[PDB]
C-alpha cells in the first residue's frame, strides 16, 4: 500500500480510486486500442460463474447420477482450459491498481490521454479466460522505466458493475486473508 | 428494391412474416445438406436459453456457463466467419447477398448465425428461385427445402421473438 | 461383389443383422488402438440422443436451460473439431456384430491387426475405433476389399453394437 | 526393482511405511516457480475416480459423455505429449525418469497424466531429494511439497485404487 505512481497522475488516481475499494495485485493485464471486448452479460457471467466455483455432501441430498455427471463438468472445463493455453498468446504479469471505476497498469507503449480501447485481463488464474473492459485513457505518465496508463472503464452495466464489486471485496478480503 | 425478382420475392414473403436485419449469411453449393434435428436442437436452444434447486446444480451451471463461453470463443476465434449483410428472412426462405450468381435450381445450403454471441451456424437446404444482381453485386432468392413439422415451428418461433425483440 | 471372399462373408455375416450403409470408414494398420469402454461409451450416449431427436415442462426450468446449453457446447466443440480434422472417406460397409468389409485404398495380408475407424452419426464429428484383424482382401473391378474381423468386444461393447446395428435396421426400412 | 539401491536414503523416505505403487505412465519434472494448484490437482482426481466407475437427465448425461469425449480428442492435437515410462508413486513423492539430472534440492513441478483416455495433467509441486543414474537414464526422486488435507486424501484414495485395480488376475 502507499504507492507513488498515484503522484504521477494526481488528478486521474484520485478519480479512480478516492472512496472506493481499489487493489493493488498482480495478474495479467494489459490495454489494447483496437477493442472487441463483446458484452457486459460475458464479462458479468465470467465474473459471477467464477465465483460460484472458486474460493476453496454429495451422497447427501443428491443421488450419485448428478454427482458423476458433475465429475464431468469438472473434467470438461479442465480439458476446454488446457485447449485454451494451446493457443491463445497470455498476457504480461504486472502489478496493477484495480477498482469498479477504472485501472492502473503498465504499458509497453504509451498512449495520450482521451485513446480508447480495452483493458484485457486474466482474472482467475486456473481458468484461462480474459475480463475485456472497453475503457478510456485518463492519464499517461512514466517513471522512468515504464508507460503507466490510468485507464477508467466505460460504464459497466447494473449487472456487470455488481458483479466486478463483489470480485473486488471477495479478492480484497482473501488477501488480508492470507496476511 | 427487391422487385428486381418479384415472382419469388412474392413466393418467399407474401402473406408471412419477412423480418429484414443485417446477419451474417450466404448461400454454399452442395449435394450434402444438413439435419433436420440439429437445425431444430440449435433453434429452440438459443430460445430456451432466453434468461436455483441444491447448491450442486447452481455450479454445475455455472460450470456449463464457463464451458460454454470459452469454447464459443475458441470457434469465433478460429472460423472463416460469414459476410456480414442485410437479408429479408421469412419461414420460406431468404433474401441475401452473395459472391457470385447461380442458375436459378441450382441447390445448396443457407448458412446463416442465428445469433451473435453464439457463433453456431444455422443450416437450411434450399434452392434457388432468383438470381438477380444490382446493388453493385448479386442478390439471392433462396427457398428452404421443406422443414418438417418440427424444425419449422422452430423456425417461425424464432422469427416472430426475433420480431417483437426488433420491433421494441 | 463378396464372393472374392466366400469363408470371410460366412464367418462375418451368416446369421445374424448385417447391414449395408455409407459412411466414412476405413482400417488403420496399428500397433495397439484399445479402449472398448471408449468404443461402449460412444455408441450408448449416440444412441440416447439419438432417441432425444418423456414429459415437456417436467424437472425445473432451470433443468431445462442446463440441458440447452449442453446442446449448444456439443455443436460448437462439434465445429471446432471439424476445423481441423481428417475427413474419413465416405465408402458402402456391410456391418455385423463379427466384423466389417470396407473398401480400402491399399491390400493387406490375412492377419494385419489394426483398427476399423467409423463415424457413426453424420451430426457428430466423432469416430468410433474397433481393433480388428483382416482376415481376407481381395479385388474386384478395382477398388481393394478388405475383411475386418473385430477383436473380441466384451458384454457391453458387444450389447452396444447390437442395439446400435439393430436400430440402424429398423431406422433403415423407414423409407 | 533395485532402483532404490541408487539412492536408499531417497527411497526410503518416499517409500517406506506407505502404499508405494510401481507403474507405467507419462509422467515428467520441470523446473518451474509455478506454484499450480491444490485445488486443481484435488478436483481433477475426484472427478477422474467418479467416472473411473428421469430420461431428460439421463440423455443429459449422454451428452457430457459425448462433449467429454470430443473435447478429450482436440487436446491430443497439438499439446505436448509426456515420456511414458515406469515410476514408483506414493503419497509422498515419486520416482522417475529424466532427461538431465538435477541437485538435490532443485525445485519444480512433476506432471503426469492419471489417466489414459484422457489427456488431462496432474501438476504437483516437488523438490529433489537425489537423483542417479543407472548407466541408462538419469532418475530422480522428487518429494511433493505439503499436499494440504483435501489433495493429500484425494490422492491417497487414488492410489489405493489404483494398487486394488492392479491386483486382478
Known amino acids: 500500500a502507499m504507492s507513488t505512481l498515484g503522484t504521477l497522475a494526481p488528478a486521474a488516481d484520485t478519480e479512480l480510486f478516492a472512496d472506493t475499494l481499489s487493489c493493488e495485485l498482480r495478474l495479467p493485464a494489459g490495454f489494447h486500442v483496437t477493442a472487441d471486448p463483446g458484452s457486459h452479460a460475458t464479462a458479468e457471467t465470467l465474473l459471477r460463474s467464477l465465483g460460484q466455483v472458486e474460493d476453496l455432501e454429495e451422497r447427501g441430498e443428491l443421488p450419485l447420477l448428478v454427482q458423476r455427471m ?4 469438472d473434467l470438461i472445463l479442465a480439458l476446454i482450459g488446457r485447449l485454451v493455453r494451446q493457443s491463445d498468446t497470455r498476457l504480461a504479469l504486472g502489478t496493477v491498481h484495480w477498482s469498479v471505476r477504472g485501472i492502473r497498469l503498465a504499458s509497453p507503449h ?65 488477501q488480508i486473508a492470507d496476511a
Do not use: I, M, N, Y
Not at 70 to 73: P, V
Open 70 to 73: 458433475d465429475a464431468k463438468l
Open 110 to 174: 504509451a498512449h495520450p490521454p482521451g485513446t480508447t480501447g480495452s483493458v484485457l485481463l486474466q482474472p482467475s488464474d486456473w481458468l484461462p479466460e480474459l475480463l475485456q473492459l472497453p475503457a478510456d485513457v485518463l492519464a499517461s505518465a512514466s517513471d522512468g522505466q515504464q508507460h503507466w496508463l490510468w485507464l477508467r472503464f466505460a460504464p459497466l452495466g447494473t449487472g456487470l458493475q455488481d458483479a466486478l464489486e463483489r470480485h473486488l471485496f471477495r479478492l480484497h478480503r482473501r
